[PDB]
């Protein structure tokens, strides 16, 4: 007598939201917000450099913890909490700009400045910088006066960038513990260091005085930098208190830089990283970490957003 | 949904129907039987999987760090960055909520729609040999055996064959 | 709308109908009468109020000042901030315009849809006892008094009761 | 003979926009963009501090207008146009960063530095800073030489943050009217002040010279600051021209900071503020002020966006 | 689309129909003929052009330079700016993709809908004088000449005129 | 016997994307992403200033290449790659902030400072700045000592802004080639320049030393600036090494600033510019240049997004 039409159903369905309604039950649904973290840096197939105790900015100056990173090469650069940029207490002027440059550099290649010195000492070391006895930043030279209290002769040194890419140049200003200890090292009088590239003009007068003991030492070194263009020249006029660059750094290509406290893992591949590991997902959204970097799903505040993949569930 | 079939004039679904999304449940002299309509099921599945492929997609846009979790950046620039990121979070959280709601509304209307299309296809096949019950069933006025039911399901049913007998039984 | 009922085959609405959104206006031997269909009205109202609750919502995201109205911030950082805020304004102004247009299109189609669902429900009730005028009216071929009209409105109307007499009046 | 179906209508409807059409008339519609401002700061149920004549940065240093705000506590902090951060003419280095810190501090709690002085004066005042006669910033000490033209002995003072949260430290450099008046106050020679915390290195040499008369005075004081971490130490090496911190500030918790020129009102509650008052609304958008803060509807350029809540209106 | 007419129960379109979007192709004693329905065509065209005018619009929001192509800005502020711009690009690229997909789905359903509305209008005109084939054609049971076909197209067709003869030919 | 209903179609259609499907063919479609560039700056109906060899910042100081731009007026300002801000080697402190101000200034109007000098020279020139023989920045005055090695008397000069709008003030600090050549020009001793407006406090000590030869010259001039409010006064206390402003600049109104390397064209109108020319389009999106400025379609990554304007194409 009759033929009936109908559709499939479950007794119990999956709740979703629509334009009109909260929590309507459908036959099937799928998650659109990723919550699964891999607690590891997934670096399969990527030239990876884990800096460990070496600070990223330390790769340009060369404290002992960074001796194996002076000319590194990488697609992925991992900074660690224990990493330190310095041996002898100090810090970088404009530090985070330089980090951002180095994170995406693809690593660094180093080259001799060609500076030659006459009338001054050039081998100043310290107990903070340890390589079987006292040492100093590998890429730098602590310039001094020939003898104690002696005059530091006003000096001019120049470096032309003869290569096709920008040269990262770094120099340091030493701030000694006393007004006396500045005079001991570089002689009396107020000392002046100046720097000039086509698109750069700045000057540096020191400031002796007592800072608290870091690494057992109350002295500080300021570090500065500029990017010297192809064919441009940079001149260092200095009367003392100067940490001279021995080498110049050039950037190799491209890379991605991350900060993390989890282990490296060459068994999983991923392009979305945060400090707690890797987000591996094809979902368009993620609720794991808003500061995730690389190629990531978009961060959203919602924990979950289910997308209906079936009809409305209408049980008997 | 908008087409009034699912959770509309069809009172409920069949938990027995594991074969497909839509189907027929006939009744006759030889007894009850149930079978799935492939074509309707496949049209809904394909449309829905095409939604999925659209949303499961690779953002090939790389973003880098602009602040620092170990060495806090200068506070002023840090607050501009946080404000900007929070503003962007607000935008995507909104986009994701609207996207899924809009898509879910459409999925439900689309499944409802396929049910309606199937229902109307059969009405047209059984031109004057059947009448419309109202609950999603067709009362057939001529004798239609299991062989005859398969003809309807497979789109081979000939209305002019059984017309006069069903016409007279009006 | 998409379903061709409102501002479609129904030529216009009734300003007399203050009782609900949709309804019936009968005509017979005992005279004209008008009454609202609760079920259809309620299905439209609920769907629409559910839209409203969705959009009337509390953004629990707090934002702070990043510039200063009494002491202008440094011009460079000030221009980055203004550019960013203007960019965000552009995004929300777009989102709000699209949201409301998209929602309004859907509301109009949805109301049109409920009208169609009600219309088709009644067609199915009056299986062979009525024919379809075309203006949104059903010409009933048997005698249907006020009592009989209420049976249609309340879903209790029995087609087999009045069939033969309406069938013969074809 | 017949039964008819139809729908309700008005003679005149509300115009809305759709994907397809501008100004289609519907039975009913509702507004989605808020335009109603309450011309008041709605602070019902909130610990509120209206700074009035006190500048926010003045709560850390303590000019007379800020004497009742030295240890305030708040959920909501209101800056006013008439507010001034200073008594003796001067300004803060990195001022807006510090404001942003203080706006969300939840207020401040003050603690003694423990600095003790020998060989110098410590009670320098002025006519600009008035508390029944001459005075000075309450939280600061104007350090001087014992007598006119006398040498200011190179000095070292240290403060360890022994507490669980960062300590906001502030000090000032005085720039006197003449080269003479610098020598009168702190003796001859070029004076140097230095500062050193784990993540901080900076130096300060003064600059005497004539600035225009503000508050009847041509002198200026620079104010500086850093956030000293738990257990870290900060050292002040100074040879003169120094305004010494007497107390250290600690942040209490959380707050929201606003700028406004309208009255406070404890009769209305609200979480969305701008300078002209409060936006109280559940609507998702607002066209009142793009710089509104707190928890606000999103600012949009459109004045109005009506959302249909009824069917299309089709009159007879 | 959702209404099952275009690429549904109508098997395909007519490449011969250059006169409008929709139309009639009759067959009778006097031979075949084809003509466009203005009203349906115009309702689809107007709705679609109204979409276009909505999207072809003048963003009167001016934006200025915040970085420099000849003299690179300070690297830190430069990276915040680039990050912000890239974030905004991501938002608009998403918005444009969704807008066009959402609009295209609706355009296709809307054209499908107008075809259905026209189809159902004609069904109602030919109340009991015709029956429904199933391929988008109406088999007319009384004699309907070219003059008679124009009456259907122009909405003047009188069903009660030809009723009994078509009714008997059932 | 029968009447049939149908729809139009082509044998071949236009592929578009929907929510459900990639590459569905429709009867007609239209492009929503603009790709057509006009390789010209379309400036019909706009007061336009093409700076050519003049740098934008040079309009305030006045090197020879900027002599015809000292009081310009514009709706649209075009910077060129060949443009230079300087004649005598130097650069601006906070340069890009000042550019952004000048780009939207609507041009500049200049006014005399009223500075009068006694006890010093005031006509210092150079070979770099050429106007038929040696010259100097038109709006500036190179202040010197009356004779070689002579003392530069500590000096105070003041300017009140008596007008209704902010006054852009600019001054320069000269850094000579030697420590000797500083003493030759302005006498011995360390020289100090200070500046003070209501919302401004800064100081400037020079730094002699050898920079590389630019324009054949190893000397540099630093340029500085502040915006002096209506009724506020600015004082210059200086002991030497000073380049004095002769005139003050005021902003005329509104403008739009662009950078470009293509020709100006008064035959086409447009409001959306990038360095390769003009985007003329009513489409909502563009894939030409993400750094386009003015009133532009939104930049998107997609090359093309077709919008269906016809039904689905179903051929025979
Ligand atoms: C810790 C304590 O009980 N008392 C400190 C005392 O140690 C400190 O003297 C410094 O002590 C450190 C190690 O604790 C070094 O021995 C310093 O000597 C060196 C150094 O190793 O850094 C020797 C080095 O050859 C010197 N090199 C050069 C190029 O000059 C350096 C250098 O002079 C300084 O680092 C410059 O600041 O010093 C030694 O100075 C004293 C210092 O005031 O303070 C006690 O409280
Ligand atoms: C206004 C006028 O006609 N002529 C000014 C003349 O006033 C000004 O001298 C200053 O005048 C102000 C009030 O107008 C004060 O009297 C200044 O004296 C004090 C001060 O109150 O600030 C006294 C105070 O005890 C001093 N304290 C210390 C710790 O030194 C201070 C202090 O020296 C200075 O504030 C440091 O700059 O001064 C008084 O200096 C003179 C000054 O050149 O200029 C006329 O034009
Ligand atoms: C290039 C070379 O072979 N040797 C340079 C030598 O040229 C250079 O001397 C400078 O040379 C330039 C042109 O090459 C000018 O002649 C400089 O003289 C002037 C100037 O024109 O700039 C003259 C001018 O009247 C002076 N004006 C004032 C107000 O003082 C200026 C001014 O003193 C300086 O610009 C300040 O720095 O100089 C001339 O100095 C020498 C300089 O050390 O170096 C050789 O290697
Ligand atoms: C910007 O936001 C970050 C978080 O995204 C803030 O850093 C957090 O600060 C809280 C409390 O101070 C700590 O519990 C977390 O350890 C921090 N998280 C990270 C990832 O750093 C940061 O303070 C904010 N910036 C400013 C200037 O306030
Ligand atoms: C950023 O935008 C603000 C406005 O949101 C600008 O400040 C306004 O400037 C105009 C004209 O100069 C004044 O009429 C208003 O009083 C200002 N409004 C506010 C709220 O401050 C501000 O100048 C812009 N920033 C920069 C650097 O140009
Ligand atoms: C921000 O992005 C711009 C591009 O939008 C970068 O500038 C480009 O740099 C590449 C490679 O270094 C050059 O090939 C182009 O000539 C540059 N384009 C433009 C328009 O300037 C810029 O380097 C980025 N900023 C930072 C700080 O990295
Ligand atoms: C329905 O109910 C039971 C309750 O235990 C639950 O386990 C089951 O997962 C539910 N079904 C679905 C599809 O969620
Ligand atoms: C339901 O959707 C999920 C996605 O989470 C999918 O894995 C699965 O194939 C679907 N289940 C069935 C029974 O089709
Ligand atoms: C450093 O070099 C100088 C040579 O100028 C030498 O006299 C001195 O002894 C050296 N010091 C050490 C530790 O080699
Ligand atoms: C640098 O100069 C060399 C010639 O010495 C030339 O080959 C090269 O192209 C120049 N580079 C630039 C950027 O001008
Ligand atoms: C219709 O017209 C009158 C004109 O005065 C107006 O007052 C009324 O508000 C209108 N109705 C609606 C619903 O807008
Ligand atoms: C129409 O909508 C408004 C929202 O502005 C609402 O307050 C009211 O309840 C509605 N009017 C009627 C008559 O239902
Ligand atoms: C300030 O203190 C010193 C004590 O060293 C004292 O000699 C001097 O008189 C004091 N001045 C005032 C006004 O109390
Ligand atoms: C600071 O040192 C004390 C011991 O003196 C210790 O209790 C506390 O945990 C330390 N805080 C940090 C942050 O290391
Ligand atoms: C269909 O095919 C031909 C192949 O040459 C092509 O030229 C034509 O443009 C196509 N039609 C459409 C509408 O794209
Ligand atoms: C098809 O759309 C295009 C938009 O690119 C338009 O120019 C044209 O008028 C349309 N073609 C036809 C035949 O209607
Ligand atoms: C510059 O001016 C002074 C007047 O003080 C004069 O002695 C000197 O000769 C002038 N130099 C030139 C080139 O005119
Ligand atoms: C500046 O002062 C003059 C009176 O000398 C006055 O007319 C003008 O309004 C003042 N401007 C401001 C901004 O106070």
Secondary structure of chain F as H, E, C letters = CEEEEEEECCCCCEEECCCCCCCEEECCEEECEECCCECCEEECCCCEEECCCECCCHHHHCCHHHHHHCCCECCEEEECCCCECCCCCEEECCHHHHHHHHHCCCEEEEEECCCCCCCCCCCCCEEEEECCCEECCCCEEECCCCCCCCCCCCEEEEEECCCCCCEEEEEEEEECCCHHHHHHHHCCCCCCEEEEECCEEEEECCCCCCCCCECCECCEEEEEEEEECCCCEEEEEECCCEEEECEEEEECCCCEEEECCCCEECCCECCEEECCEECCCCCCEECCCCCCEECCCEECCCCCCEEECCCECCCC
Output the residue whose Cα is nearest ligand 17's atom 13: F123
C111:D79 CB<8 A? no
Cα B161–Cα B163–Cα B169 angle in degrees, nearest 5? 135
- Tally of residues, chain B: 170
Rg (CA), chain F: 29
Rounded to whole angstroms, the maximal C-alpha distance in chain F is 118
CB atoms within 10 A of CB D276: 17
Q: Where in chain D is the domain with CATH 2.10.77.10?
A: 1-46+263-316
Nearest to A101 among E71, E75, E90 (CB): E75
Q: For D1-46+263-316, which CATH superfamily applies?
A: Hemagglutinin Chain A, Domain 2 (2.10.77.10)
Output the residue whose Cα is nearest ligand 2's atom 9: D217
Phi/psi of residue A62, nearest 5 degrees: 90, 60
Nearest to A18 among B25, B68, B104 (CB): B104
Cα of E130 to ligand 17 centre, how many Å? Answer: 112
Nearest to D158 by CA among D245, D253, D40, D251: D245
Cα of B20 to ligand 15 centre, how many Å? Answer: 39
Contact A173, A132 (CB under 8 A): no
Contact A207, D203 (CB under 8 A): yes
Output the residue whose Cα is nearest ligand 7's atom 1: A12
β-pair type (F76-79, F48-50): parallel
Nearest to C127 among B9, B94, B131 (CB): B131
- Classified as helix, coil or strand, E129 is coil
Q: How far apart are CA D186 and CA F153, in angstroms?
A: 23
Q: How far apart are CA D186 and CA D190, in angstroms?
A: 10
List CB contacts of F91: < 8 A, sequence separation 6 or more.
A199, A201, F85, F220, F222, F223
Helices C75-125 and B75-125, packing angle to 10 deg: 20
How close E77 gets to chain F, by Cα (Å)? Answer: 11
Task: Indicate which CATH number applies to the domain containing C31.
Answer: 3.90.20.10
Q: Hey, of A5, A16, A17, A20, which one would you mutate to test binding to chain C, going by the most C CBs within 10 A of its CB?
A: A20
Q: How far apart are CA C46 and CA A230, in angstroms?
A: 70
Nearest to B113 among E2, E76, E102 (CB): E2
How many structural domains comprise chain B?
1
- Classified as helix, coil or strand, A66 is helix
Contact F150, F219 (CB under 8 A): no
Residue with token string 């846009």: B61
- Burial label for B139, CB within 10 Å (0-12, 13-18, 19+), is middle
Closest-lying ligand 13 atom to the alpha carbon of residue D146: 5
Helices B75-125 and B38-55, packing angle to 10 deg: 170
CB atoms within 10 A of CB D162: 9
Q: Where in chain A is the domain with CATH 3.90.209.20?
A: 47-262
Helices B75-125 and D95-103, packing angle to 10 deg: 60
Q: How far apart are CA C23 and CA C45, in angstroms?
A: 14
- Classified as helix, coil or strand, E148 is helix
Query: Which approach determined this entry?
Result: X-ray
CB atoms within 10 A of CB F49: 24
Nearest to D306 by CA among C100, C105, C108, C48: C100
Q: How far apart are CA A62 and CA A64, in angstroms?
A: 6
- Tell me the CB-side half-sphere exposure of residue E70, using CA atoms within 13 A: 19
Listing DSSP states for C88-120 in one string gives HHHHHHHHHHHHHHHHHHHHHHHHHHHHHHHHH
Cα distances (Å, whole numbers) of residue A247 to A138, A254, D129: 9, 21, 55
Q: Which ligand is nearest to the CA of A142?
A: 1
CB atoms within 10 A of CB A271: 19
Strands (DSSP E) found in D8-75: 14-16, 24-26, 29-31, 33-34, 41-42, 48-50
Cα of A11 to ligand 7 centre, how many Å? Answer: 9
- Least CA distance to A95: which residue of chain D? D199
How close C81 gets to chain E, by Cα (Å)? Answer: 10
Cα of F309 to ligand 16 centre, how many Å? Answer: 8
User: Which residues in chain F (226-265) have CB-CB distances under 8 A to chain D?
Assistant: 233-235, 237-238
A2:B139 CB<8 A? yes
Contact C31, C143 (CB under 8 A): no
- Least CA distance to C4: which residue of chain E? E117
Query: Is residue B127 within 8 angstroms of chain E, CB to CB?
Result: yes
CATH code linked to domain A47-262: 3.90.209.20
Helix (H) or strand (E) segment spanning residue B85: helix B75-125
Query: Is residue E106 within 8 angstroms of chain D, CB to CB?
Result: yes
Cα of D28 to ligand 12 centre, how many Å? Answer: 6
Helices in A89-210 by DSSP H: which ranges?
95-103, 179-186
Rounded to whole angstroms, the maximal C-alpha distance in chain A is 118
In angstroms, the first-to-last Cα distance of chain A is 23
Q: How far apart are CA F267 and CA F48, in angstroms?
A: 13
Contact D221, A193 (CB under 8 A): no
Q: How far apart are CA A49 and CA A107, in angstroms?
A: 9
- DSSP code at position A313: P
The structure tokens listed for F26 are 């429709």
Which chains are adjacent to chain B, needing at least 3 Cβ pairs under 8 Å? A, C, D, E, F
Output the residue whose Cα is nearest ligand 11's atom 2: D12
Phi/psi of residue D135, nearest 5 degrees: -150, -160
How close D225 gets to chain F, by Cα (Å)? Answer: 16
Nearest to A211 among D154, D190, D235 (CB): D235
Chain E residues in contact with F84 by the CB 8 A cut-off are none
Contact F169, F175 (CB under 8 A): no
Query: Is residue A209 within 8 angstroms of chain D, CB to CB?
Result: yes
Closest-lying ligand 5 atom to the alpha carbon of residue D291: 5
3-state helix, strand, coil in chain B (%, to 5): 50, 10, 35
Please name every residue paired with D3 in a beta bridge, in sequence order, or none if there are none: C26, C138
Closest-lying ligand 4 atom to the alpha carbon of residue B73: 27
List CB contacts of F56: < 8 A, sequence separation 6 or more.
F77, F79, F83, F85, F99, F102, F103, F257
Resolution, given in Å to one decimal, reads: 2.4
Query: Is residue C90 within 8 angstroms of chain E, CB to CB?
Result: yes
Q: Residue B157's domain spans which residues?
A: 1-170
Query: Is residue B57 within 8 angstroms of chain E, CB to CB?
Result: no
Q: How far apart are CA A170 and CA A172, in angstroms?
A: 7
Chain C residues in contact with B87 by the CB 8 A cut-off are 63, 84, 88
Closest-lying ligand 14 atom to the alpha carbon of residue D231: 1
List CB contacts of D309: < 8 A, sequence separation 6 or more.
C48, C52, C107, D26, D28, D29, D30
C76:F96 CB<8 A? yes
Q: How far apart are CA A221 and CA A126, in angstroms?
A: 12
Return the exposure string of E79-105: e unless at least 16 CB atoms fall within 10 Å of the residue's CB, then b.
bbbbbbbbbbbbbbbbbbbbbbbbbbb
Nearest to D194 among A205, A207, A214 (CB): A207
- Classified as helix, coil or strand, D110 is strand
Q: How far apart are CA B148 and CA B156, in angstroms?
A: 9
Which chains are adjacent to chain A, needing at least 3 Cβ pairs under 8 Å? B, C, D, E, F
Phi-psi region of B4 (alpha: psi -120 to 50; beta: other; left: phi over 0): left
CB atoms within 10 A of CB F232: 18
Which chains are adjacent to chain F, needing at least 3 Cβ pairs under 8 Å? A, B, C, D, E
Helix (H) or strand (E) segment spanning residue D168: strand D167-175
């Amino acid at each position: 007598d009759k033929i009936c039409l109908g559709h499939h159903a479950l007794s119990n369905g999956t709740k979703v939201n629509t334009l009109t309604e909260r929590g309507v039950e459908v036959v099937n649904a799928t998650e659109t917000v990723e919550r699964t973290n891999i607690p590891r840096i997934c670096s399969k197939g990527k030239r990876t450099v884990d800096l460990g105790q070496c600070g990223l900015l330390g790769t340009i100056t060369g404290p002992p913890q960074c001796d194996q990173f002076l000319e590194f090469s990488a697609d992925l650069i991992i900074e660690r909490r224990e990493g330190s940029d310095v041996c002898y207490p100090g810090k970088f002027v404009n530090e985070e700009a330089l980090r951002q440059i180095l994170r995406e550099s693809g690593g660094i290649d180093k080259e001799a400045m060609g500076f030659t010195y006459s009338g001054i000492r050039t081998n100043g070391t310290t107990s903070a910088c340890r390589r079987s006895g006292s040492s100093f930043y590998a890429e730098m030279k602590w310039l001094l006066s020939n003898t104690d209290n002696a005059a530091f002769p006003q000096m001019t040194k120049s470096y032309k960038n003869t290569r096709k890419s920008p040269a990262l140049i770094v120099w340091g200003i030493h701030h000694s513990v006393s007004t006396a200890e500045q005079t001991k090292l570089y002689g009396s009088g107020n000392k002046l260091v100046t720097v000039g590239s086509s698109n750069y003009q700045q000057s540096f007068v020191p400031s002796p005085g007592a800072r608290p003991q870091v690494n057992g030492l109350s002295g500080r070194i300021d570090f500065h930098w500029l990017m010297l263009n192809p064919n441009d020249t940079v001149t260092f006029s200095f009367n003392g208190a100067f940490i001279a660059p021995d080498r110049a750094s050039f950037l190799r290509g491209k890379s991605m830089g991350i900060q993390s406290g989890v282990q490296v893992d060459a068994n999983c591949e991923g392009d979305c990283y945060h400090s707690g590991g890797t987000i591996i997902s094809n979902l368009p959204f993620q609720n794991i970490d808003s500061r995730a970097v690389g190629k990531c799903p978009r961060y959203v505040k919602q924990r979950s957003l289910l997308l209906a993949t079936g009809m409305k569930n209408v049980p008997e | 949904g908008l087409f009034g079939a699912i959770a509309g004039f069809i009172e409920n679904g069949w938990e027995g129907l594991i074969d497909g999304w839509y189907g027929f449940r006939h009744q006759n002299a030889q007894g009850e039987g149930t079978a799935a309509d492939y074509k309707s099921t496949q049209s809904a599945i394909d449309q829905i999987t095409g939604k999925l492929n659209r949303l499961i997609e690779k953002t090939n846009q790389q973003f880098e760090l602009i602040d620092n979790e170990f060495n806090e950046v200068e506070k002023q620039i840090g607050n501009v960055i946080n404000w900007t990121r929070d503003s962007i979070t607000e935008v995507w959280s909104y986009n994701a909520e609207l996207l899924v709601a809009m898509e879910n509304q459409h999925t439900i209307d689309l499944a409802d729609s396929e049910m309606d299309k199937l229902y109307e296809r059969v009405k047209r096949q059984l031109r004057e040999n059947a009448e419309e019950d109202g609950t999603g069933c067709f009362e057939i006025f001529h004798k239609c055996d299991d062989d005859c039911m398969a003809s309807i399901r497979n789109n081979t049913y000939d209305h002019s064959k059984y017309r006069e007998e069903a016409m007279q039984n009006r």
